[PDB]
Coordinates of C-alpha atoms in Angstrom, one line a residue:
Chain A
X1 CA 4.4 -35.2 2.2
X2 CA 4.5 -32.2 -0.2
X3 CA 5.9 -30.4 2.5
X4 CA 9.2 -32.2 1.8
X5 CA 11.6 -30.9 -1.2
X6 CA 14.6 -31.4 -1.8
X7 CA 18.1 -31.0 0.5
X8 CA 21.2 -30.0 0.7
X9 CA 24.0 -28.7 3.6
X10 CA 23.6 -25.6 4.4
X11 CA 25.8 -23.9 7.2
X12 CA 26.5 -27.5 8.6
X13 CA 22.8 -28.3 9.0
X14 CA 20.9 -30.9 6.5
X15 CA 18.2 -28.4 4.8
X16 CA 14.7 -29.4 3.3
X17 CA 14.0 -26.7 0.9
X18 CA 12.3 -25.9 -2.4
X19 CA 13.6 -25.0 -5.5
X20 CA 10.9 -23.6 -8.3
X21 CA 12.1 -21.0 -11.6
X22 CA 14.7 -19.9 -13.0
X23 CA 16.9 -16.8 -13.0
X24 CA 16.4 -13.8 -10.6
X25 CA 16.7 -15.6 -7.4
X26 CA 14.3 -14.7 -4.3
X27 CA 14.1 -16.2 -1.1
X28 CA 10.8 -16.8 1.0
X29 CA 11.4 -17.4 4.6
X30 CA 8.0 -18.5 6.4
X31 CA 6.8 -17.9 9.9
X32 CA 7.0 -19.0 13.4
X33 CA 4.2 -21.3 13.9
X34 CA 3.5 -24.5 15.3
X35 CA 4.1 -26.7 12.1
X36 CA 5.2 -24.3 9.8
X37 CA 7.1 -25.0 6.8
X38 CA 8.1 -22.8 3.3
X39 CA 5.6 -25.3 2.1
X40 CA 2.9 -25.0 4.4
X41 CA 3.4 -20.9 3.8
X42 CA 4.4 -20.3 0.1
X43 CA 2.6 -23.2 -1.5
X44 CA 0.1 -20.6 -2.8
X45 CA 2.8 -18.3 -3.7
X46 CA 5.9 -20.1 -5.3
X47 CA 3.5 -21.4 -8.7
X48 CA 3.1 -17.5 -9.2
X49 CA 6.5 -16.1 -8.6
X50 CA 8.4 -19.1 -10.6
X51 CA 7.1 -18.0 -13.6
X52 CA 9.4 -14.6 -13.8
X53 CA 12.1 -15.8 -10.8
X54 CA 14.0 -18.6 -9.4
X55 CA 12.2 -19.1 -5.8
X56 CA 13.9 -20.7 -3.0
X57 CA 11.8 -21.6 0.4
X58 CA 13.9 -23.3 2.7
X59 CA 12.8 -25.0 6.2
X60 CA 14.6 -23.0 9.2
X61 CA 16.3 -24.5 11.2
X62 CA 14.0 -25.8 14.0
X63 CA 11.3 -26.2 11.7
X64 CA 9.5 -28.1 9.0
X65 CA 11.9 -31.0 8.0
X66 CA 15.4 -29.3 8.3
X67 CA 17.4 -31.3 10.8
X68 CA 17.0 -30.1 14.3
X69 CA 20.8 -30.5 15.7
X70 CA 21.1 -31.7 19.4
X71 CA 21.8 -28.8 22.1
X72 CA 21.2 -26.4 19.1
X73 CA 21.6 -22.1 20.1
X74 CA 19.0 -20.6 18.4
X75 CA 19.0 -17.4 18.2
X76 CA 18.6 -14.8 15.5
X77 CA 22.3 -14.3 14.5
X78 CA 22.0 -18.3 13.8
X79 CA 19.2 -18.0 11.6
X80 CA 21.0 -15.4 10.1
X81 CA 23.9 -17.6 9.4
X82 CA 21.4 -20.4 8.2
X83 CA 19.8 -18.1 5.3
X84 CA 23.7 -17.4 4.5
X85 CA 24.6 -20.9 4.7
X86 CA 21.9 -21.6 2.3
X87 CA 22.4 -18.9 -0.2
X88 CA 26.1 -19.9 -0.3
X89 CA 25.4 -23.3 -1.2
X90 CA 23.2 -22.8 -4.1
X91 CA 25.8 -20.0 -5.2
X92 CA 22.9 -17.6 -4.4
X93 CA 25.2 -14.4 -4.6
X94 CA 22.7 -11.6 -4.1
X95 CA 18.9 -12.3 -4.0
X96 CA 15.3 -10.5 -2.7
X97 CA 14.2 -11.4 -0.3
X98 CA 10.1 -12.4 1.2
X99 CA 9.7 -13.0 4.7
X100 CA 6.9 -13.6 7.0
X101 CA 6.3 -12.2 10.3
X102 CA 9.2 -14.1 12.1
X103 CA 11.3 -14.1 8.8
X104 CA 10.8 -11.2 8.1
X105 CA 12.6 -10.3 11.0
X106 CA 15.2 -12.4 9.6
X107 CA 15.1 -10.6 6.7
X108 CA 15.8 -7.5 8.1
X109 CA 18.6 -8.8 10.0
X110 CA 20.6 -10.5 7.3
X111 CA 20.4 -7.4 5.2
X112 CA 21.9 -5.8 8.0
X113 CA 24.9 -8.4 8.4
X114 CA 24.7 -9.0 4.9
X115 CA 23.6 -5.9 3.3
X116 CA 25.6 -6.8 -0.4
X117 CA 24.1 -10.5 -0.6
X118 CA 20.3 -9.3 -0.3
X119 CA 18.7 -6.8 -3.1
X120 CA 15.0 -5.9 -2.4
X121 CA 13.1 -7.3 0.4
X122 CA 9.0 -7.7 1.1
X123 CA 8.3 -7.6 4.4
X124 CA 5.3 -9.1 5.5
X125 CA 3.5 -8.9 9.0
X126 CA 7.0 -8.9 10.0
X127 CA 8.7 -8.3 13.2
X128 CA 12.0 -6.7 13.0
X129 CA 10.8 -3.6 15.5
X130 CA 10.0 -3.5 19.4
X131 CA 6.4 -4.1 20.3
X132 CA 4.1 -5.2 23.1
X133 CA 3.4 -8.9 22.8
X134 CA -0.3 -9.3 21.8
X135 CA -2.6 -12.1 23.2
X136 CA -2.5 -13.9 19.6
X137 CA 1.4 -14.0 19.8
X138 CA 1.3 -15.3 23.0
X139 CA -1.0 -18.0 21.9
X140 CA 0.7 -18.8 19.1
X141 CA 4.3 -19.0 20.9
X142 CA 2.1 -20.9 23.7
X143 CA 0.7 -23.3 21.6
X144 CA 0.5 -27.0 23.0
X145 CA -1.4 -29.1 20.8
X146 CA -4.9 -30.3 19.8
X147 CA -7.5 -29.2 17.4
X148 CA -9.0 -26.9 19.0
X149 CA -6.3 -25.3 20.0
X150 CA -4.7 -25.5 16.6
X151 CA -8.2 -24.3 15.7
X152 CA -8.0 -21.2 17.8
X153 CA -4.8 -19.8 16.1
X154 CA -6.2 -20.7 12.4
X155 CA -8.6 -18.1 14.0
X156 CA -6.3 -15.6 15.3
X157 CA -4.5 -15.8 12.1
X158 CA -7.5 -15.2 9.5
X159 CA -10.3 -12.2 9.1
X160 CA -12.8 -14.8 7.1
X161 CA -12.8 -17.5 9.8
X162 CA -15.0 -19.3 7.6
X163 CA -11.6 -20.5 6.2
X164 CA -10.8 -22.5 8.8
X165 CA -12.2 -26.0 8.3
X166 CA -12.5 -28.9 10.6
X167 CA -9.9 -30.5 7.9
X168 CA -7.4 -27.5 7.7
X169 CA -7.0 -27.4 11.7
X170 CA -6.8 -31.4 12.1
X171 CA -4.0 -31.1 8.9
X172 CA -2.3 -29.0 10.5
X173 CA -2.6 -30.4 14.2
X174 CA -1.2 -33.1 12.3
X175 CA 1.9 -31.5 11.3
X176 CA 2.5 -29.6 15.2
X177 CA 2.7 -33.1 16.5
X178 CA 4.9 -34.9 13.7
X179 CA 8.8 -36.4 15.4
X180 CA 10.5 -33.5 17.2
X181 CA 8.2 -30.6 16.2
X182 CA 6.7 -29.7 19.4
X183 CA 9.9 -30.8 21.3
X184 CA 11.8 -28.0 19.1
X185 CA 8.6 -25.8 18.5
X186 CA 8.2 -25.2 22.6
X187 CA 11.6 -25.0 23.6
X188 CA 11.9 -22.0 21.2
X189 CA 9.9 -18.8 22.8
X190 CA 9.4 -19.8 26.6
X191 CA 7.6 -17.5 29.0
X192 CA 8.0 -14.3 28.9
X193 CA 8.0 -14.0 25.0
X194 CA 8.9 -10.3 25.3
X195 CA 12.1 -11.0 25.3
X196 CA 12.0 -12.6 22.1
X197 CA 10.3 -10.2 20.0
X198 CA 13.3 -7.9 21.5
X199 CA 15.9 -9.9 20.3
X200 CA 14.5 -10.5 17.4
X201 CA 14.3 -6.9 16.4
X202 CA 16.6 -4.9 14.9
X203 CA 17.1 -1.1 16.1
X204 CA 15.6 1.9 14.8
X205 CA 19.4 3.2 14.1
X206 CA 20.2 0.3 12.0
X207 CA 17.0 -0.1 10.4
X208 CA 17.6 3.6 9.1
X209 CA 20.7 2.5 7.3
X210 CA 18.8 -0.2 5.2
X211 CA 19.3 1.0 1.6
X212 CA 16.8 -1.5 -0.2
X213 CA 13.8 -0.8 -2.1
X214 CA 11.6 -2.0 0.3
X215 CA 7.4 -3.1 0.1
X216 CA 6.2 -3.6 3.5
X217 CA 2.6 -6.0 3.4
X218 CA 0.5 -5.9 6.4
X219 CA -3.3 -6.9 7.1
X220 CA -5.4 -4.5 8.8
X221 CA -7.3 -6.6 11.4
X222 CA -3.6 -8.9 11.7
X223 CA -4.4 -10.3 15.7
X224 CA -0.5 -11.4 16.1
X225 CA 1.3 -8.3 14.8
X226 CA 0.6 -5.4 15.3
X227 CA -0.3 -3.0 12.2
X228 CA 1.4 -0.3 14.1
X229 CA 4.8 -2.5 13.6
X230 CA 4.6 -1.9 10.2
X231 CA 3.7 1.5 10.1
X232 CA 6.7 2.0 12.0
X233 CA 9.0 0.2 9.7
X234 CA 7.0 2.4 6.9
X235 CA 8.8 6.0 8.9
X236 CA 12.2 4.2 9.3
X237 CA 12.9 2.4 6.0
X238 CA 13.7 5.3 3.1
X239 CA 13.3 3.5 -0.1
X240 CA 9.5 2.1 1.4
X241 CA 6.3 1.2 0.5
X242 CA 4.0 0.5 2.3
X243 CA 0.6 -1.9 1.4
X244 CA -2.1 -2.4 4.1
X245 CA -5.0 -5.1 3.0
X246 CA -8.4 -4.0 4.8
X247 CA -10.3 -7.4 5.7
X248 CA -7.5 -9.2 6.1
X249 CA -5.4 -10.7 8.9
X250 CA -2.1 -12.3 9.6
X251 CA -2.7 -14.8 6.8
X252 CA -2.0 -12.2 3.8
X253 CA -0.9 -14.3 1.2
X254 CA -3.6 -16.6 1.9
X255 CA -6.2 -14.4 2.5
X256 CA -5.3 -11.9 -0.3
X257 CA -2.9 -14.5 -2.4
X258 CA -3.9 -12.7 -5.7
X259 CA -3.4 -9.3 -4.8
X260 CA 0.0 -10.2 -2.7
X261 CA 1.1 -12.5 -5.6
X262 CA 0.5 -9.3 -8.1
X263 CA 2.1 -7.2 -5.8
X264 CA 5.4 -8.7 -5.2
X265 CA 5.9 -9.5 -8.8
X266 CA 5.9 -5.9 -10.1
X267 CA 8.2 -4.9 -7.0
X268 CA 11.0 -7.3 -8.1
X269 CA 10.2 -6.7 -11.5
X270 CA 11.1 -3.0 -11.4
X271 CA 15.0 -4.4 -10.2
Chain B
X1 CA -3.7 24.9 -25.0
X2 CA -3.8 21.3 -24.8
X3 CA -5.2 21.5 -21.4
X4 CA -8.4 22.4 -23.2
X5 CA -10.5 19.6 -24.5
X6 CA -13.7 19.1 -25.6
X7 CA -16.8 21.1 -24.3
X8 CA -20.8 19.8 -22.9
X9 CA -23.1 21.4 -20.7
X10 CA -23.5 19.6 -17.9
X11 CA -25.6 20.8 -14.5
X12 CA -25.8 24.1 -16.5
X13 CA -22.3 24.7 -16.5
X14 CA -20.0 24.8 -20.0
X15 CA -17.5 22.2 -19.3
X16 CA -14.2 21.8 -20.2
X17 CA -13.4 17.8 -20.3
X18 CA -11.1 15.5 -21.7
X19 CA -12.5 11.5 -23.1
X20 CA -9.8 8.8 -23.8
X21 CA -10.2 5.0 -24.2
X22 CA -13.0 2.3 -24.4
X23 CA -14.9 0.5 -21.7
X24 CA -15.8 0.7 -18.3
X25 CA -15.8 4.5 -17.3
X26 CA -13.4 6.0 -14.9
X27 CA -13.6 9.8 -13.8
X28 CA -10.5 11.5 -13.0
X29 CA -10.8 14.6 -10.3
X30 CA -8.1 16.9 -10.2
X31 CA -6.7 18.9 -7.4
X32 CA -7.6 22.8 -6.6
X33 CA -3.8 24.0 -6.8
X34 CA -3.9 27.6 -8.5
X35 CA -4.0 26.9 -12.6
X36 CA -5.0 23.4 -12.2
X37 CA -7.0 21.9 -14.6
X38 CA -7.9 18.0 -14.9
X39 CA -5.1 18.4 -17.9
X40 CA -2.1 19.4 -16.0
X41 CA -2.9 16.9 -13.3
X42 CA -3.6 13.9 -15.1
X43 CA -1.6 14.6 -18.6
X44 CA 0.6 11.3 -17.1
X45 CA -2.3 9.1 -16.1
X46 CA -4.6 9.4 -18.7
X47 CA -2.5 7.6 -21.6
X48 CA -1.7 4.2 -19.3
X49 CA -5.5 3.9 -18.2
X50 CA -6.8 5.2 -21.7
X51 CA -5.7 1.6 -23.0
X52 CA -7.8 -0.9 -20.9
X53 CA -10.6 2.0 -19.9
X54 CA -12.8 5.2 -21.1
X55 CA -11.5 7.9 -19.2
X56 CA -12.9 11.2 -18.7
X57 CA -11.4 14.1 -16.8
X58 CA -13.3 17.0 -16.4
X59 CA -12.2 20.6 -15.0
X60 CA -14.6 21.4 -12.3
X61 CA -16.6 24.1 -11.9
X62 CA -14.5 27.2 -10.8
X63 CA -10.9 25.6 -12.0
X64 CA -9.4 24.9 -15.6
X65 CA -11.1 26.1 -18.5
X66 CA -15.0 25.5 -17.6
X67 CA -17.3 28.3 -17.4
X68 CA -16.9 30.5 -14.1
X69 CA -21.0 31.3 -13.4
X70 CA -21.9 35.0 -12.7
X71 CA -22.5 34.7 -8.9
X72 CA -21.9 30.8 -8.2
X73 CA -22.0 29.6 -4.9
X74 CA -19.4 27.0 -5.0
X75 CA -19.6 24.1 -2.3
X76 CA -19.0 20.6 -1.6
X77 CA -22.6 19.8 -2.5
X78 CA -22.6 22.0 -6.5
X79 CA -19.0 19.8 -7.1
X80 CA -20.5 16.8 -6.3
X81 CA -24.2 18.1 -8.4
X82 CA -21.2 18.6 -11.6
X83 CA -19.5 15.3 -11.2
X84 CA -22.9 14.1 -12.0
X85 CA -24.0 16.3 -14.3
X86 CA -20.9 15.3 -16.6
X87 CA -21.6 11.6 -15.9
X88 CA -25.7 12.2 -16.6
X89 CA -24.3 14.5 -19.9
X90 CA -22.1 11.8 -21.5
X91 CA -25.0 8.5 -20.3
X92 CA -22.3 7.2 -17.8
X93 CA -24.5 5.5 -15.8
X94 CA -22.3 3.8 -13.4
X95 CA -17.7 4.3 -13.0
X96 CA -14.8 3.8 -11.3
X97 CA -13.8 7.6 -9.5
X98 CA -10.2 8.5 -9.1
X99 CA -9.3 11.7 -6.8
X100 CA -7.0 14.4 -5.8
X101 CA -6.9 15.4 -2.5
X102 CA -9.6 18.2 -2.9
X103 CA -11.1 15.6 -5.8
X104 CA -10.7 12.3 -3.6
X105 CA -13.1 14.5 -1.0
X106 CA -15.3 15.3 -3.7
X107 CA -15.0 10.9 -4.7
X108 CA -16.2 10.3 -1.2
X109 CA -19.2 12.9 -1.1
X110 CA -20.4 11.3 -4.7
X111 CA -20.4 8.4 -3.4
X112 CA -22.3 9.1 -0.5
X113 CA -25.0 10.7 -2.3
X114 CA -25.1 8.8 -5.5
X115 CA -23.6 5.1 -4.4
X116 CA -25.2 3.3 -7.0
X117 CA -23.2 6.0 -9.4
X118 CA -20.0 5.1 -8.0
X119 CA -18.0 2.0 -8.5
X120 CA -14.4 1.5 -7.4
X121 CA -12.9 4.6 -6.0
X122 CA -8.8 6.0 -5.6
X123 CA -8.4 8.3 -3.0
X124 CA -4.7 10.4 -3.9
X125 CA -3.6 12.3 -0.9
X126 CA -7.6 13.0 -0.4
X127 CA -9.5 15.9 1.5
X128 CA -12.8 13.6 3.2
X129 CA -11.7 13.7 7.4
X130 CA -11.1 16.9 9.1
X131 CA -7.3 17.3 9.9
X132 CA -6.0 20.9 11.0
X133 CA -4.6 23.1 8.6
X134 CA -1.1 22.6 7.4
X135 CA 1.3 25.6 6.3
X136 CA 1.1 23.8 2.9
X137 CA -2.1 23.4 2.8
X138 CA -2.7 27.2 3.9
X139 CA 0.2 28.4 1.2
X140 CA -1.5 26.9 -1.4
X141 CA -5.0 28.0 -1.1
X142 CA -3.5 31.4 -0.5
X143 CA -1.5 31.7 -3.5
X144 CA -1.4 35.3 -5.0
X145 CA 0.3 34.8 -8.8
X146 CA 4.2 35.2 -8.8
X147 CA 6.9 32.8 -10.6
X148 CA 8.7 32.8 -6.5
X149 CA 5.4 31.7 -5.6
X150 CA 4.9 28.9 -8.0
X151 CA 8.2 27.5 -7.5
X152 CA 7.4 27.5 -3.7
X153 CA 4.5 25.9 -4.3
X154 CA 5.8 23.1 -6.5
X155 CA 8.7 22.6 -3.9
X156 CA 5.7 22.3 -1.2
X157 CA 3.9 19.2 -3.9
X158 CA 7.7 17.6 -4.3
X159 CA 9.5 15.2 -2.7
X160 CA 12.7 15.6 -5.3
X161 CA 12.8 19.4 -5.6
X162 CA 15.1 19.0 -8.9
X163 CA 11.7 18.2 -10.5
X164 CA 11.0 21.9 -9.7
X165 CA 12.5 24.3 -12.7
X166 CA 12.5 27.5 -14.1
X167 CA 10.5 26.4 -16.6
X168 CA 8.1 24.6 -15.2
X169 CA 7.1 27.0 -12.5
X170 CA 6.8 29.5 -15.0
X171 CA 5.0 27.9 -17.6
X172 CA 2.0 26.9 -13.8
X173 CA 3.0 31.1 -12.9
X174 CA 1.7 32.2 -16.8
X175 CA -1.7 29.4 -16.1
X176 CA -2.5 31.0 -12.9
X177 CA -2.9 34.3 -14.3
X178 CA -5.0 33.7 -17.3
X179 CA -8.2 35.8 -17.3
X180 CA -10.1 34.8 -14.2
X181 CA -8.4 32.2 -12.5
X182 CA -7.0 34.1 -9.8
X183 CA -9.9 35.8 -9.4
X184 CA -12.4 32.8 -8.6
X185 CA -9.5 30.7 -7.0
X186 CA -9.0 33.7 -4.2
X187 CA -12.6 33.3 -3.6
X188 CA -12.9 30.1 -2.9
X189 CA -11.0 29.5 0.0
X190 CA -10.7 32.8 2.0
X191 CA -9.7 32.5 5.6
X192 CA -9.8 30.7 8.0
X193 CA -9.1 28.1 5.7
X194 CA -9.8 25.2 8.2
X195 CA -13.2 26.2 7.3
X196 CA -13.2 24.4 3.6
X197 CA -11.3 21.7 4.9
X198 CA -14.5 21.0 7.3
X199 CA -17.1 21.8 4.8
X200 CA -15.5 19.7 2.3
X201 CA -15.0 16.5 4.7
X202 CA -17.6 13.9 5.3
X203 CA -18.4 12.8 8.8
X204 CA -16.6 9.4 10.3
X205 CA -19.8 7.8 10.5
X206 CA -20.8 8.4 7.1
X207 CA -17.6 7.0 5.5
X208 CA -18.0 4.2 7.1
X209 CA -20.6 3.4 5.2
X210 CA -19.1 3.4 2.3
X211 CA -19.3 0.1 0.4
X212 CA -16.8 0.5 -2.3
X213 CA -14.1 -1.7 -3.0
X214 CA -11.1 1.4 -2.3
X215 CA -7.7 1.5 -2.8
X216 CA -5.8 4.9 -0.5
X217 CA -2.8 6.3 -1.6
X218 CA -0.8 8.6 0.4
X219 CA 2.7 9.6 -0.1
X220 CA 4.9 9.8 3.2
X221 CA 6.4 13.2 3.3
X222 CA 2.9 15.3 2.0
X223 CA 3.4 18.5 3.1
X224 CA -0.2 19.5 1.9
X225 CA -2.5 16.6 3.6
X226 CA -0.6 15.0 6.3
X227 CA -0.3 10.7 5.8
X228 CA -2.5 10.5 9.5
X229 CA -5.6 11.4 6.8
X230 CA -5.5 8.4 4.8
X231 CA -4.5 6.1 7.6
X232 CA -7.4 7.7 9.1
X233 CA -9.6 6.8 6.0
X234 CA -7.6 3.4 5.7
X235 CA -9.5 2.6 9.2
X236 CA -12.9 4.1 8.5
X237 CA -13.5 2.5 5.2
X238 CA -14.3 -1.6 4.9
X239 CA -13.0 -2.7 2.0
X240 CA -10.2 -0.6 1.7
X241 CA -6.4 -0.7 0.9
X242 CA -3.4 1.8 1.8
X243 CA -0.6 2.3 -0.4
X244 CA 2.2 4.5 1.0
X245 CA 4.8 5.8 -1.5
X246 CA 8.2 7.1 0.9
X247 CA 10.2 9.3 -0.9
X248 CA 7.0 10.6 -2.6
X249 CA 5.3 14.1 -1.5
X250 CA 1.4 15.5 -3.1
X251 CA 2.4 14.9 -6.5
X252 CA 2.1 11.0 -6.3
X253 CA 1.0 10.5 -10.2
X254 CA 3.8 13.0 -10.9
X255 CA 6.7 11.3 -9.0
X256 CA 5.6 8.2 -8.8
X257 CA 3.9 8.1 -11.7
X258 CA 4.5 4.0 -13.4
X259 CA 3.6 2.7 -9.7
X260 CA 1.0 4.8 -9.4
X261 CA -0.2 3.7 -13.0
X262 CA -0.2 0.4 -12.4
X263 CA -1.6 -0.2 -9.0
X264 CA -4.3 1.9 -10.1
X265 CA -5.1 -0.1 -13.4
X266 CA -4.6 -3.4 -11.8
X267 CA -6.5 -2.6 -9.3
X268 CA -9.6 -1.6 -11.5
X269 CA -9.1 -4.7 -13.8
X270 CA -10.5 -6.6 -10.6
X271 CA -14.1 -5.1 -11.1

């Protein structure tokens, strides 16, 4: 399974992560859904940003193959701690940092905490700000599985749903029901899910105080977050920019990998 | 002067234009700031494109250093009728458009009339959807020449206002003034100036339409055409993107100039 890299202890917790470049290090923290890994989300993008950086996409804990600890807290302060945890064992002093909807709430929280140990940050279809669940989050969070439900959010996530092959959504139905996934997975944003997007946001005081450059990424027609979450973080962050991809959904650097690839690269080479 | 360039007759008119580069055509339209000329506002731009692209930068009709007609009824429609005269004049038979607010409306009304004479198309801070007169918008159109005037109106463009000097507001003062460019300028948009920004957009449901690949660029604090425009045009237009600079006013090539450069080129070197 390509999913599964290499691993190391990280804040007490066995970590499956991937290692890929040299120098400039930059962290990619994936997503919330059901079988998501920093494989199954960077695969497209590491190749490209290894080139000019040292990329590091760890499994969070509760997710891909990172141990899932018995009576666990998760919560965002311990995912926090888990992105720490990681950067201090690979003696990852300062880095950028690329997170995905979910992590890029965690990336807005851990430069908060940790405001000297993280440089520039790309925030993409990422939650970090207050908004109304949608029905796509709701599905996603409320996924049980099957194909055709696994179908459904391949769906929710893409604008070209000609994308989403009878082999992607049975892959990836495949990885929702590997050992402990679902048990972890479900147990993670029960009903109601509001609460969750609130506690993983981070207020519009503190987000004000953020002094990295900053290049928020969202797809227009994204069905899980909304666009208007990232126009918001586009008025509170100073040193922003913000990119919006017409035709293009939750599934950015997927749908638009070249663009987002070309993107990101120029950001963190201007540092 | 090195804001004057080379001369043709195009659509009748004496023109004033500048031609860099090899290759696929791109047409730069300036502004209409007081003194503006396609010099002035592209001097920065047309070097980095010059090297990967033929680009030509015309003054338009009424602005820079192109013949002022006896009795010219200047309108959306006679801009657009110049754009491709120049294009017909130098056998530019299909390009890439790249405009300035009162340019960018002037990109989208081309390419309504003449899509198969438009390519790609950047839209800067771009007149195109009605949006209520602004007191920046209103102070620059009713600019009477003055150095205290200039300087206002540079610190109105500006996000850094220590961009702004003595010098510089003097040396756009001494343009304004030369031999009948305050004269055809003060006739052009006489109030109510919500008038011309009407005239000069195009309706929703003809932008829509539009079936150029786009990139929108906006930056956040534009005193001059409020960000709401382009996220307006970043929703009317298919294949579009929106690229908001923060900490970046109107003068986006100006103040953010290497970004600016870059997205733009990269974003051409697609086609």
């Amino acid at each position: 399974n390509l999913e599964i890299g290499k691993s190391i202890l990280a804040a007490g917790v066995l970590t499956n992560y991937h290692d890929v470049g040299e120098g400039q290090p930059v962290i990619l923290i994936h997503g919330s859904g059901p079988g998501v890994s920093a494989y199954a989300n960077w695969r497209l993008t590491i190749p490209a940003l290894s080139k000019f950086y040292r990329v590091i996409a760890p499994d969070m804990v509760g997710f891909g193959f990172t141990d899932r600890p018995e009576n666990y807290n998760y919560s965002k302060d311990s995912w926090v701690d888990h992105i720490i945890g990681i950067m201090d064992a690979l003696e990852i002093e300062k880095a950028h940092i690329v997170g995905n909807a979910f992590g890029g709430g965690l990336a807005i929280a851990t430069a908060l905490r940790y405001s000297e140990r993280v440089d520039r940050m790309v925030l993409m279809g990422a939650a970090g700000t207050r908004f109304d669940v949608t029905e796509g989050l709701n599905a996603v969070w409320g996924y049980t599985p099957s194909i055709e439900n696994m179908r459904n959010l391949l769906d929710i996530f893409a604008y070209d749903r000609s994308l989403v092959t009878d082999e992607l959504a049975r892959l990836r139905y495949e990885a929702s029901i590997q050992p402990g996934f679902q048990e972890s997975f479900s147990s993670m944003f029960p009903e109601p899910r509001q609460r969750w997007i609130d506690a993983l946001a981070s207020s519009d005081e503190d987000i004000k105080t953020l002094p990295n450059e900053t290049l928020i990424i969202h797809g227009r027609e994204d069905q899980v977050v909304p666009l208007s979450s990232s126009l918001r973080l586009g008025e509170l962050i100073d040193r922003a920019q913000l990119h919006v991809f017409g035709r293009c959904g939750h599934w950015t650097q997927i749908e638009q990998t070249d663009r987002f690839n070309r993107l990101v690269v120029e950001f963190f080479n201007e540092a």
